[model samples]
Target: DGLNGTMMQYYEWHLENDGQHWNRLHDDAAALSDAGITAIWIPPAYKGNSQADVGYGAYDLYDLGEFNQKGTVRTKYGTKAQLERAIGSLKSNDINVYGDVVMNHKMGADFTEAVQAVQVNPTNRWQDISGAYTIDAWTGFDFSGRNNAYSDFKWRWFHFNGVDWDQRYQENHIFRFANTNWNWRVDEENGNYDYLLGSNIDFSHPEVQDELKDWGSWFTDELDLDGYRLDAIKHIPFWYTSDWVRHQRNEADQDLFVVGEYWKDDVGALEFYLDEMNWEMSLFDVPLNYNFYRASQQGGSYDMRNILRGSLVEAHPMHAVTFVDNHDTQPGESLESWVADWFKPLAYATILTREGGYPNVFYGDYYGIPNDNISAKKDMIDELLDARQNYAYGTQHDYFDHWDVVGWTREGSSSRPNSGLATIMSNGPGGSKWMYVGRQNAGQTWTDLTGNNGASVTINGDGWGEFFTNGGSVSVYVNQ
Candidate 1:
């Protein structure tokens, strides 16, 4: 779902191989569950083209079969039974599972042999595909001919007559057909293939819709899946896909969560999907992540005050998924820059304690000079899970950015019933001096969670006082 390479490889290996490290997945899930996480989003579980270990290069929709290229349930991670067992163990502990689902183009078909091998159709069935094809030799169609390629479009991988496909096209392609600069007409009836990107599937075809519905039903019904993370939704026709999802959820008779991969700069556009759309699940807020990355990184250019305060709006506070790092950005210097040892814990404190979207914690064994081991993150996840399940009623407010000092606060009632706690963070290398506002304690005495409070203040009227300090960040809790 990312432009990066490692994420694709991880899913590819998991799909093409049968032998999986079930124990690792189970242990990770258990830790997350113990931390009080409600759900875990894993990669696609269907079969994919092993020739290139990217799961998005899907061939067969029913590739959830027993055999893979690496071996019998012995490719990269573990066996199918092992996966089932891991799911079982996690579910037994009240943890939900959300699997990634790909509905994009299938693997490139080998058209050279006497029997052309299409990824989706191993039996070479013409009825299994749309006959769309590009006439010229080009990587993508030029959509500028429509005078709306770059300016007013969704910005996908392909183009036609210089006019790139926009969100409108994605919704209306079935009725108004467009031609590509490759001198190819989009065959809504039959899919077409061009260049290295492979054939884009024409989901407008009834057969394709039927196939996807069947596929979704089988997985949710048989595997007991809680939800889905849909791949390449922006590129495909949302009108059809949205309806497709609706049909599948209806057939399955369950709440089928679905989030799409649309890496757009303006998050407001996603509102078409996130707010009014019929899909059950929404995407992790990409803008929020970028904000955090820029502010948290030691030498980042953004002000920590702006990053923290800018996102505290009331419209969509907790709806977006917030996180410090993920599998895709794991090795990118962004992680080291933003979530370095010095600021990582504070970043967690900011996200977990804030009254915003469901926070996601990333953990994986990535490759790097100093590989980020998953264990450290696992410990942090434990703390977040605790906060999520325990804490309540804390208002998040951003402080003014001044020099190296930048931060915010989440203050709540100091009464024991409210579990009052305040978290403040500084994104700069230099120590910060700031004041945190919180409710007055009944006993007229308070102690900082860091255990350095030497002064106690009493409330005058509304039970309020200030806790000030000079450091990276601190969490002050009101104890009865």
Candidate 2:
């Protein structure tokens, strides 16, 4: 549909009830489809450090909850059969499934190996704080549980560049393997940004590259994945990810949609990475999310007009995937910046009604974060989703004249009936704006679909009508 897509982050931070998520997702597929979700980004579907590893601490790339590794036979989500059935159900509903790929580092190794290493500054990775010393790093991984069911690619210290913990000395420090340097062409943050956690993969090694390529091919075919949500792109080498994505697409003959999480608040960093990767993938608009966070925290005092300023979506909409909040940003998480509850509707309106960037709805928001006492935004999100699928289309116009009041309109297309929308919001006092809907809709009456306001406005002969929004709220006016 020309990239006018909506994605759901299908899982949250506390989906810890083991061995039931797959079936739950399968059951919710039809509901999500009916709610106009075009695609879903599922959590990492691999064996992690333990049964409740949340799929990030990757222990076995070949094991999809099929083996008795990591102290359990099944992962936190479910069994392999359950995952396959869930994917099948989602595909049947015309909803694309995006698998979360965490390739930056691996954890929960089968054994530890002694290796020569040097400690580097944690804040500035370029500075060698200590000389080379032999340390025991957890770099061995043999999937004895699977018995080589998928592939016999055993991992060792040679496949990785460094590790964090020295088992022999029982010390924690950022170690760089001797005779090895950080991979070139990665995010310049912290000097290199190559080492994130656990055993960092060495992208410079040809064998490592080959094994990753082979694993990618196997993963795509084995899961029949529609696309990928690449995790920690800032840490991985740009050239290797580029090649891996190209290889997968070429092998499958499908234009797989790929979005990466760079996790930087600076839009310039994201732009630099995009240019370095030749724009082969889209990136989450981390800056925009932070902007919303600031706006939410500041409330009425924040300038609503500058919400999109310096954002990837504002500058490079085609390559931006806009979102409100995610697992990392949810309450009590490490990157906690949950947008205030009052401003969530306004944030959703900003992303969903706009004619740029693809939008992603966080699972924690759609479904309440029960552990944190945060309520679900399902009701308001449903209204926005309906507007996005049905009315948010055609020629767009923006009115950013006021500091706190902003509005945009879509001049309905001839192909879509009643497909025009006028979205207005104010962070300050309630206000109104006279905006152009369309010449064709002149004299037509429009009412607030979100019902934040009750009054109806009639378009003048010149195709303009006054739209109103309550203080600290948003209103979407659509023709009945």
Candidate 3:
């Protein structure tokens, strides 16, 4: 379960909010497990600003479809019961479920308060743009619909540091509370990225910290979640997040696989964030995704040898959660950085076949995006899954020495059948690499599982086989 553990982000940005996703996920549990997805990273199950929100716009932290908040009873996915049933089905199939956790901000407040505030420069948040004035901030969350079932936590203006809307003037500006300041331990983007969308929560406040930590433990116990996919840690204070994670782990009494989405293209930024996290958590490999995107955009001119050069997986593989794309990175989304269709399989191979980081497969790539006219890559990824689940074991050998083509091999162990294979990918002309597959099976016949060439290769007397890949494609050779 440690090595070769594959995950899948189950929902995309364009999913129709029909409140039937839980049922759909429950129905696909068996199929998903059969296809080698050991874990499922689901969308936020809590109530958002509205029924149609994707859940990044978090509203009531305690309302996971249990309360009639946000103008609806059920979330975009479904009710709390539906979500629990879906998680149970996944667990029955031995698939771990990771719920999306959004703690950066809150939306759809029940009331607005006339609080003293000052406007800040949107680009340079360190400077103030306007003098202190009374602006109606939507910082009061009575949760009247919830009726204080979970807790009587009434959020006031002090709970938040900034807001976007001033209901009094019917205008929009970055309004910071008069006495509050931007969080210092956040991304240095725009001088400070602590104030993101919606009402930015103040983590330094004692009440806020206690309430959030309580929700953290409560949500984990409520869903019996296997882990979490933290929505935006780059904006959330890094120090407090680490403390919360530590507290959650202590409360859960289990090793939770927590991965935060920092969403920075620079590996140096990710590394620094990890340091701030005390190296206790893993982050999505954003740099590696951009690498694939650029590589695909440039085609043959991109150097294949530098695929993992500046990636988190390269520097800290154990703390790297590798992914090709996610909801935000999909086409037309806010973080629009979609990898080319032709380079999809090649990028998948680079993550899945490697012994470094935990790789995640995107639902949009596997099941097809009907709205975006993106077809399914099920057959291609299924082939890679077979290699990862079965043949990706034992010692790994790297031959990342070429600009156009590169390959590596896995030596078979005494544990599993055909537990070794050779994998190669090329963005340029078709080429070959003589990677060794182990001397134990010197003359064994190997077939290209990718089937790009519809051919076979025999390991020479020593343990090497000349693996081949088509231009802008990938190939996996395993025992027939």
Model 1: per-residue lDDT, tens digit, 281-326? 5666566655566655535345665564434212365345566565
- Candidate ranking (TM-score, best to worst): 2, 3, 1
Per-structure clash totals for the candidates: 35, 0, 0
Model 3 poorest ten-residue lDDT run: 1-10
Cα RMSD (Å) between model 3 and the true structure?
Answer: 1.2
Off by over 4 Å in 3: 1-3
Model 3 / residue 231 / CA error / Å? 1.3
lDDT tens digits, residues 232-291, model 2? 989999899999888888888656899999989999999998988789999999999999
Better of 1 and 3 by lDDT: 3
lDDT of 3 at 296: 80
Query: Candidate 3's residue-wise lDDT over 1-480, tens digit each?
Result: 434799999999998899999999999999999989999999989889999999888888788887888889999999989989999999999999898999999998888999898989999888899999999988889888888887898898899999989999988898889999887699999889899888999888989999988999999999898899998999999888998999899999756999999999999999999999889889999999999888988888999899988999999999999999888888999988888789999999989988889999999999888889999889999999999998888889999999999988888676787788899889999899899889986999899888887658899999988888889889998996
Displacement of residue 267 (Cα, Å) in model 3 is 1.1
TM-score, cand. 2 vs. native = 0.98
